[PDB]
Amino acid sequence: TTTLAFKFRHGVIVAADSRATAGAYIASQTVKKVIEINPYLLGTMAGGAADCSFWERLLARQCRIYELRNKERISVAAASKLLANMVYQYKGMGLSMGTMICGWDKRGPGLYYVDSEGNRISGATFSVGSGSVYAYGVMDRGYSYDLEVEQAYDLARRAIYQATYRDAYSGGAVNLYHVREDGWIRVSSDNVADLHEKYS
Amino acid sequence: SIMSYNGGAVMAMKGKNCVAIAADRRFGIQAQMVTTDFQKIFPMGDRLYIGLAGLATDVQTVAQRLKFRLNLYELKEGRQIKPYTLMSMVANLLYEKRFGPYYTEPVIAGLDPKTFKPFICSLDLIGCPMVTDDFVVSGTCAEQMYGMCESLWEPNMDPDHLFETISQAMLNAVDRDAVSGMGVIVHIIEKDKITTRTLKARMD
Amino acid sequence: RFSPYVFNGGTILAIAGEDFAIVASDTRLSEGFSIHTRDSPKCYKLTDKTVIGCSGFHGDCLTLTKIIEARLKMYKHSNNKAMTTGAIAAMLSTILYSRRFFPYYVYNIIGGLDEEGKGAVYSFDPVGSYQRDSFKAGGSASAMLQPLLDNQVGFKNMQNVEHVPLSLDRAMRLVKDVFISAAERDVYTGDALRICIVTKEGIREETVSLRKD
Amino acid sequence: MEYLIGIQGPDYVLVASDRVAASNIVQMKDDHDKMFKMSEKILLLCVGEAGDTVQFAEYIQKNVQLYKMRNGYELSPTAAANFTRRNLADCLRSRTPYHVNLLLAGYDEHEGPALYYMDYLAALAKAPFAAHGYGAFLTLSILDRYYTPTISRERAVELLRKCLEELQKRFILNLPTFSVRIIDKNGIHDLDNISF
Amino acid sequence: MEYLIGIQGPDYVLVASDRVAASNIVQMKDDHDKMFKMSEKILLLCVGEAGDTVQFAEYIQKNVQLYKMRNGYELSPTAAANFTRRNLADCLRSRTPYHVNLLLAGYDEHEGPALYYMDYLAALAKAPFAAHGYGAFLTLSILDRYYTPTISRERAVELLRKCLEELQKRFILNLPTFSVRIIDKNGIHDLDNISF
Amino acid sequence: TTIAGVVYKDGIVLGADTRATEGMVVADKNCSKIHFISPNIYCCGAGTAADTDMTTQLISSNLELHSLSTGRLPRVVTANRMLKQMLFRYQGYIGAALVLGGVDVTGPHLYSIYPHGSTDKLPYVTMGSGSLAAMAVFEDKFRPDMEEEEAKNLVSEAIAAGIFNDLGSGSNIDLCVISKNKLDFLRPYTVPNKKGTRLGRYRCEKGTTAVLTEKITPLE
Amino acid sequence: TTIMAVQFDGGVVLGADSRTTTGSYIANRVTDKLTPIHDRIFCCRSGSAADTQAVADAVTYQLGFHSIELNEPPLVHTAASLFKEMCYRYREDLMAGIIIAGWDPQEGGQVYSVPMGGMMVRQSFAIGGSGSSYIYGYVDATYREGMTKEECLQFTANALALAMERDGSSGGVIRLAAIAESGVERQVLLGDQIPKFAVATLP
Amino acid sequence: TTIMAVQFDGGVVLGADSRTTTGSYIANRVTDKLTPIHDRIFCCRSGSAADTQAVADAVTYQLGFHSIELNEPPLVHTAASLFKEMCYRYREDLMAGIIIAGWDPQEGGQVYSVPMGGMMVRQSFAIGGSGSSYIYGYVDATYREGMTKEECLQFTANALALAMERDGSSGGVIRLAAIAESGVERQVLLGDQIPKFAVATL
Amino acid sequence: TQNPMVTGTSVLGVKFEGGVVIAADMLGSYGSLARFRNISRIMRVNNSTMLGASGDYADFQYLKQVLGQMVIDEELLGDGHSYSPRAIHSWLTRAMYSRRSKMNPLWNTMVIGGYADGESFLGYVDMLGVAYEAPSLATGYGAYLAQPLLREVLEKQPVLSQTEARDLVERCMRVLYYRDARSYNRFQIATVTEKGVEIEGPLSTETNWDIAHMIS
Ligand SMILES: *[B]([O])([O])[C]([C][C]([C])[C])[N]C(=O)[C]([N]C(=O)C1=[C][C]=[C]C(C2=[C][C]=[C][C]=[C]2)=N1)[C]([C])[O]
Ligand SMILES: *[B]([O])([O])[C]([C][C]([C])[C])[N]C(=O)[C]([N]C(=O)C1=[C][C]=[C]C(C2=[C][C]=[C][C]=[C]2)=N1)[C]([C])[O]
Ligand SMILES: *[B]([O])([O])[C]([C][C]([C])[C])[N]C(=O)[C]([N]C(=O)C1=[C][C]=[C]C(C2=[C][C]=[C][C]=[C]2)=N1)[C]([C])[O]
Ligand SMILES: [Cl-]
Ligand SMILES: [Cl-]
Ligand SMILES: [Cl-]
Ligand SMILES: [Cl-]
Ligand SMILES: [Cl-]
Ligand SMILES: [Cl-]
Ligand SMILES: [Cl-]
Ligand SMILES: [Cl-]
Ligand SMILES: [Cl-]
Ligand SMILES: [Cl-]
Ligand SMILES: [Cl-]
Ligand SMILES: [Cl-]
Ligand SMILES: [Cl-]
Ligand SMILES: [Cl-]
Ligand SMILES: [Cl-]
Ligand SMILES: [K+]
Ligand SMILES: [K+]
Ligand SMILES: [K+]
Ligand SMILES: [K+]
Ligand SMILES: [K+]
Ligand SMILES: [Mg+2]
Ligand SMILES: [Mg+2]
Ligand SMILES: [Mg+2]
Ligand SMILES: [Mg+2]
Ligand SMILES: [Mg+2]
Ligand SMILES: [Mg+2]
Ligand SMILES: [Mg+2]
């Protein structure tokens, strides 16, 4: 897997590949690794497929309950914290999860990295998964807070693409989302083979 | 597993008065692709090719050590080696290392240099030979390869059909294997020519 | 070390059509180098609209299918309607995850009709990860069947071919072909192929002989 | 932990390597050189286990030089790469394996510039660019993103610098300085070290 | 990997900590803060295993703030140190041990400045200066060499800088920036980050 | 693998299946497991295939050197000794499990030979992962001094038992019948298994596969 | 396996069961565990089939060559010594529990045990193999000084029958041999001929 | 240890050796392995001394209480059932090879084996413990249907003596008991009174 | 049970027209030692159902106790309903699975035969909860030595008479005595038909040892 996200002037870009594997067997090329927690909050999945899906679905449940009880949107901080507090209890039991919680709340664009080891950290950019090292190289050389919207799309797409090229465990399609002040949008889905054609 | 460290896949296939041999092009170390034009199929004669998958170091070693022995064989004898005789030469080489083997499992494809009859075989890493009249496969996606070849192969295929079958068997097989692919090369061996193609292929 | 698992073989397959779903499996049940029986299907009717294929450790296949049956009735009692194909899939995901720390050793594929009468396939890993698919192979020979389905149903790696709708007749031919190919090479797959065809009119059953070696 | 990188253009090969020699938590040397001159137009860059790396590289170097003395002309980059591979592979299953990872960069009169990659198993690949060490994980995609076969040497040094900056930013180890050399028709040229 | 340092002068305690959050070969955050404000005049600096570190420090922090709310005045740096210790020690042999190493810095109206050191086993030691992490191995002897009990805060920041420069020179990890805070009679003050 | 042998009134019948597996995948549907030792001696092999191939070839070759020298038809006991002394020397690391049968100047003889070098001389034996299925048939049905066709029926039934009950065994039944007067190497004897009929045409037209690069190299 | 040999005035009687096992599969139900080493000297074999066959063939060779050289029948004690030397020297690589018995003109009927490890000891009678555990009490109660050949045959057949009933690794038929100046007489007790002792069912 | 019991018409005979070992040190050379569980019901114990003592005391308690409640002598079959329940339930934590034998008015003399693992089977006669291995062939050849009490005593004493000579973990004295309607008669065979069988010298 | 102690070997079963026959030797082995040579490894469960068990005999006696008590409980009600063979096979599958799922198996492999409502029932359950039905079954070494012979006969003639099924079982028991080193030549045959469950024994097979003189 390769997932990335970054904050910038115009919100938060979120992108992922779509491959799943069982050892070296390619189990799927069409996994949705960006989960719609609510209309203003996305979670990304890397690591154990069942673990990520379950715990992010549970997070969506809890955020929704929260919203009902409190009569307001959960913050990115609080959502990411709910997730960390849920998984902390399982440390050492072999869960494997690395997620980015991406939104826009009263503090503006929000991005937290949360994993099954117990880390929870806010930051400007992150990449997670077996391909992350490859995505970081490209993302880091092109990233700027003042990226224009379309440049930010290009960067995310290209970083995931390049990761799919080097990392045997990333592939399929690049799926790209943009969190804006009034909600996330799905921006594109591009098969890596069609991107290959384009970038040469 | 030692044989999955570099990944990779080769197959060979028999038609009507022709043979085909194919391989992926990736050289990678566990998850990391290093190169996309790694050679796995080596000429052993005008109409006789060996394909090796397994640990890349041994792929190279075996190909080079085999060539050493073959060249000596051909200089000493009158003549070009016969396919079956190459098989036996390779069997002997591998079985010498019975107790510390090379980690490669070759396939051989060619035409008898006098009679032009098609020949294909594979061997395991200690040199057990297996001749077949249809296809042979070796590599990290052998199951995928077997599925494709069992479903598509037919007897008596002409060069064009043989090419389409070996190509489609390879592409679709390696597209279910994380550590094989990054391109596919195919050689079609006929009496009067060798045709070498690289295929449009997924690069993930 | 008592081991609580053993591998019992079996291949499964589902295909979604416009207005049908196929779920198919072989009928061999194996252990070690032996055959327990030649007549043990891996498909189970859940509703008029939903069939499930299960392979892996047979002790878990039996238990899990019995759990699913009970839960379908509990749902129906508490909500006054049968579970949909999609709700069965979602529920199965949670039942698998409940054993996250002692898993059911089962590969599951659901085939059925969705709420618009279209074919639906959902495929699972043993701890409950899943998604919708157009087709899927599972179990012992899955690596052998999957690539061919990718190519022939997905049209992958093919140029100059019209991406036509999958007819039931062609889907049927494909299913019989791939299992026959699998019986050639997977030692666990053989004896017979059982095919369930789910349509608006109900669920019908075909059986095809496979090699017994 | 040790970083090697190479970039081959039309008529040169550019190479760089970190200058740290580490032991446990400390850098013990900050001006270390991981490059070995084999001939006028060949550099071997070697990393891996202590002892093995120098013993191996110097053995190769002496034998390449010996070849020159016996025969009055030098081994081609390709021939030297294969010689290097024969030795490594022959030692792999022996009582004395060498745990080393290598690049071999050279320029041949007739074949032009060449860059070879070798791992400790003795798999040999020719490549237009390549890198070794954990740092490779963070830089190979930078090279995939920007490299073109006709890349000029000025832009290669720039591309190299982007790689090295990415290590300063993102890599967990402190690699503050790098040796940089280029090889072309006129031999081996030392460039300024790239430093932070 | 994580570095904490403290230096106590006559009427203040200076503390600093690296700003990296690492994972495998990469820095994932370069502006990380390892300090937790417990009260107006108490900082807890906490490193160790992921999850344990925040879960532990925030539990202490909430309870110290609770103590303020219940009682209308704050726990002394020494009380809070012993409260922290009691918790860590009571968890040591439980089903939920916390794998964390700490410093506790504070200023009391009557006792003056204090710096406490605690390891994951929950041994507590009061010290004139101290440090945690692999970086401590390279910097404690710098502190032993130049610290005096009457050291002024300007020279403490200089002394701190010597320590941090020694990491840049000698330590294999890339720790380029540090948070620096001081505590005295008037509370907690943020100083400029020390950066390279 | 299922391999087996019987002594009948006038000779030996050896039998084998034709499946070779790699893990739990069939690699070869038509492996030949009944190996030539000398014109009057054959040897079925089970266990590690390279080992049974190379071991039988080596002993056959040494026996041909022996008979060239002695000018006589080789003895079964000689093949047995050579095999077992070599297998013993290698301490079971050569994984050849063999059924050795032939006819020499002293009549028919049959031995089973194990990888660690023990042998048993017996009027019927089986080896391989199917050997208990094949042995069940023999215990139930063997009689001394069978006629040729009864012996052949019995062996092929035993091999069939292995074929159908052992996942390691399959495909065809080969027999080899060896008497004073005759050698009948019957490959295949029976073909009890056949691939099902390929229900779809997939007729992949020229151009279906996209090509990046092409080089034609002509030859003479 | 269960093996046994008994001395009498003028010779020896030997006996074995006939079961070879691999795990609990019977790979030979009619094994001949009593192997001639020379005209009037046999060994009874237990433990590894491969090992005891290799060692017996080697000793046969050594003894045959020695005997031609000396131009006399070999001593039983010599055959035992040769087994002992090979079983002791290679005690780390062999699993062999052996009984050597036979007749020679100098010392008459003799029985030697060479158990695992490679010690050697002469005895009036010997038992070995996995099944021998179950007959120690029986042989110790039943042995008498001065038994005739026929008594030694019956004693042996009874002991082995008892062991075979109880030891899962022993069974099949009972092979017996008697060795004396006059030669070697071999026979097989099978089916109904094996001595029979009721299962002690409830009154 | 070697333990044995034998049924006769009217009662049972029980026997044991008297050796307790820790490794190959003899921690008691005159152990009493035959323990009364009720007036006419004994158990012979082998395996762990701690386990079989704790289990026997427990079953003695259960059986005594049951017997007072019913106001009748307990069945031998009941005593065996109670050992079985405890030896089966705790089979993973106990090392206990037991023989239960005795007399009751309903079924007369009875012998039950409760070997390790906790199965229970009635038998004409039973043997157990490490030394029993060496007397299977002897008891199988020598046992006859219809032996008298006296014959059972001699048969038991001989079997035990043979086992004791061969089994390093058995030895010392032979304790015997006969149980019948009339009561329990115990005795010890020591030294010269133990049956004797020559070492087979050349 | 973590470690089996006294154990039984194969159990065989085959359906025939009007019933089911099962067979099991009478041995409890303690490792290689043929220790208890007269124990029954077959249970009459009720009138329509019988069970035979391989594996740990104490665990079998526990199952027998439990199952016997369940049948008594049900009979007490006198309500016209009885556990069918299939119900008992279901119960047994759940009980073994459940014990397997607590990592504390009952160490047995079982064959359930029955006859109810005109149908022969024959079902297998193992210590892991693997369960299925088939026209013939054989546990332990019987899976390798007896099942091939049962299946071969059944393929030529799927419907056997009672006497044919009995003879076929006897031939299988002989093979087992020849080739399983934990078998014993003293066995029971249990049969269930319309009339109920009959257990016969102790039975022995004839054996042939002519091959003992065919070595030279
Ligand atoms: B990515 O991190 O590489 C990707 C993330 C995404 C959420 C799918 N992760 C995976 O592909 C993981 N794969 C699985 O978890 C997986 C896929 C198929 C089967 C199984 C399985 C689980 C339990 C028992 C058997 C099989 N797991 C990762 C690569 O492992
Ligand atoms: B007796 O000691 O029980 C008997 C005596 C022997 C014939 C001299 N020993 C055995 O039956 C032994 N069996 C074998 O040695 C044997 C025979 C055939 C094959 C194998 C084998 C060994 C290793 C791996 C696979 C097969 N062993 C003994 C008790 O096992
Ligand atoms: B018999 O089974 O050999 C005999 C029967 C017993 C008296 C009922 N058992 C033993 O002698 C066993 N010995 C003990 O159980 C024993 C006695 C005293 C101390 C210890 C001991 C145990 C653990 C650590 C230290 C000491 N064990 C014997 C066969 O184990
Ligand atoms: Cl997708
Ligand atoms: Cl809430
Ligand atoms: Cl943070
Ligand atoms: Cl060579
Ligand atoms: Cl050669
Ligand atoms: Cl021989
Ligand atoms: Cl085999
Ligand atoms: Cl036998
Ligand atoms: Cl011994
Ligand atoms: Cl012995
Ligand atoms: Cl016991
Ligand atoms: Cl006992
Ligand atoms: Cl004592
Ligand atoms: Cl009994
Ligand atoms: Cl009953
Ligand atoms: K098959
Ligand atoms: K033998
Ligand atoms: K026996
Ligand atoms: K005691
Ligand atoms: K003693
Ligand atoms: Mg691939
Ligand atoms: Mg990829
Ligand atoms: Mg088969
Ligand atoms: Mg070394
Ligand atoms: Mg913890
Ligand atoms: Mg050995
Ligand atoms: Mg205890």
Explain the layout of strands and helices.
This is part of a larger assembly, with 9 protein chains of 7 kinds.
Chain C lengths: L10 E6 L4 E6 L2 E3 L2 E4 L5 E5 L2 E7 L1 H22 L5 H14 L7 E8 L5 E6 L5 E4 L1 E5 L2 H11 L15 H18 L6 E8 L2 E8 L4
Antiparallel strand pairs in C: 1-2, 1-10, 2-11, 3-4, 5-6, 6-7, 7-8, 8-9, 11-12
Helix pairs in contact in C: 3-4
Chain F lengths: L2 E6 L2 E6 L3 E3 L2 E4 L5 E5 L2 E7 L1 H22 L5 H14 L6 E9 L2 E7 L5 E3 L2 E4 L3 H11 L6 H18 L7 E7 L2 E9 L20 E8 L2
Antiparallel strand pairs in F: 1-2, 1-10, 2-11, 3-4, 5-6, 6-7, 7-8, 8-9, 11-12
Helix pairs in contact in F: 1-2, 3-4
Chain I lengths: L5 E3 L2 E6 L2 E7 L2 E3 L2 E4 L5 E5 L2 E8 H20 L8 H17 L6 E9 L2 E7 L5 E3 L2 E3 L3 H4 L1 H10 L5 H18 L7 E7 L2 E8 L13
Antiparallel strand pairs in I: 1-4, 1-7, 2-3, 2-11, 3-12, 4-5, 6-7, 7-8, 8-9, 9-10, 12-13
The complex binds the ligand *[B]([O])([O])[C]([C][C]([C])[C])[N]C(=O)[C]([N]C(=O)C1=[C][C]=[C]C(C2=[C][C]=[C][C]=[C]2)=N1)[C]([C])[O] (3 copies), chloride ion (CL) (15 copies), potassium ion (5 copies) and magnesium ion (7 copies).
The site of one chloride ion (CL) has 5 residues of chain H, from loops.
PDB class: hydrolase
Keywords: Proteasome, Multicatalytic Proteinase, NTN-Hydrolase, Hydrolase
Entry title: Human 20S proteasome complex with Delanzomib at 2.0 Angstrom
Radius of gyration of chain A: 16 Å
CATH topology of chain A: Glutamine Phosphoribosylpyrophosphate, subunit 1, domain 1
What is the CATH class of chain A? Alpha Beta
What distance separates the N and C termini of chain I? 48 Å
Bound molecules: the ligand *[B]([O])([O])[C]([C][C]([C])[C])[N]C(=O)[C]([N]C(=O)C1=[C][C]=[C]C(C2=[C][C]=[C][C]=[C]2)=N1)[C]([C])[O], chloride ion, potassium ion, magnesium ion
PDB class: hydrolase
Keywords: Proteasome, NTN-Hydrolase, Hydrolase
Entry title: Human 20S proteasome complex with Delanzomib at 2.0 Angstrom
Chain A: Proteasome subunit beta type-5
What key attributes describe this structure?
part of a larger assembly; 9 chains; F: 220 residues; five-stranded antiparallel beta sheet; G: 203 residues; alpha+beta; Glutamine Phosphoribosylpyrophosphate, subunit 1, domain 1; 4 helices; 30% helix; binds the ligand *[B]([O])([O])[C]([C][C]([C])[C])[N]C(=O)[C]([N]C(=O)C1=[C][C]=[C]C(C2=[C][C]=[C][C]=[C]2)=N1)[C]([C])[O]; binds chloride ion; binds potassium ion; binds magnesium ion
Characterise the protein shown here:
- Helix content of chain A is 36%, strand content 36%.
- With 200 residues, chain A is an alpha+beta fold.
- Chain A has one domain (1-200): Aminohydrolase, N-terminal nucleophile (Ntn) domain (Glutamine Phosphoribosylpyrophosphate, subunit 1, domain 1, 4-Layer Sandwich), CATH 3.60.20.10.
- In chain A, strand 12 (173-180) and strand 13 form a beta hairpin.
- By secondary structure, chain C is an alpha+beta fold.
- Chain C has one domain: Aminohydrolase, N-terminal nucleophile (Ntn) domain (Glutamine Phosphoribosylpyrophosphate, subunit 1, domain 1).
- Chain C contains 4 helices and 12 strands.
- In chain C, helix 3 packs antiparallel against helix 4 (168-185).
- In chain D, strand 11 (177-184) and strand 12 (187-190) form a beta hairpin.
- In chain D, helix 3 runs antiparallel to helix 4.
- In chain D, 33% of the residues lie in helices and 35% in strands.
- In chain D, the strands form 3 sheets. In chain D, strands 1, 2, 10, 11, 12 and 13 form a 6-stranded antiparallel sheet that branches. In chain D, strands 5-6-7-8-9 form a 5-stranded antiparallel sheet, with helices on one face.
- In chain F, the strands form 3 sheets. A 5-stranded antiparallel sheet of chain F has the order 10-1-2-11-12, covered by helices on one side. A 5-stranded antiparallel sheet of chain F has the order 5-6-7-8-9, covered by helices on one side.
- In chain F, strand 3 and strand 4 form a beta hairpin.
- Chain F has one domain: Glutamine Phosphoribosylpyrophosphate, subunit 1, domain 1, CATH 3.60.20.
- Classes of the chains: A alpha+beta (200), B alpha+beta (204), C alpha+beta (213), D alpha+beta (196), F alpha+beta (220), G alpha+beta (203), I alpha+beta (216).
- The B-F interface holds B 46-47, 91, 94-95, 98-99, 122, 124, 126-130, 132, 142-143, 146, 151-152, 160-161, 163-165, 167-168, 171, 191-200 and F 20, 22, 25, 27-28, 30-31, 48-51, 53-54, 93, 202, 204-206, 208-219.
- One magnesium ion binds at residues 174-175, 177-178, 180-181 of chain B.
- Chain C: It comes from Homo sapiens (Human).
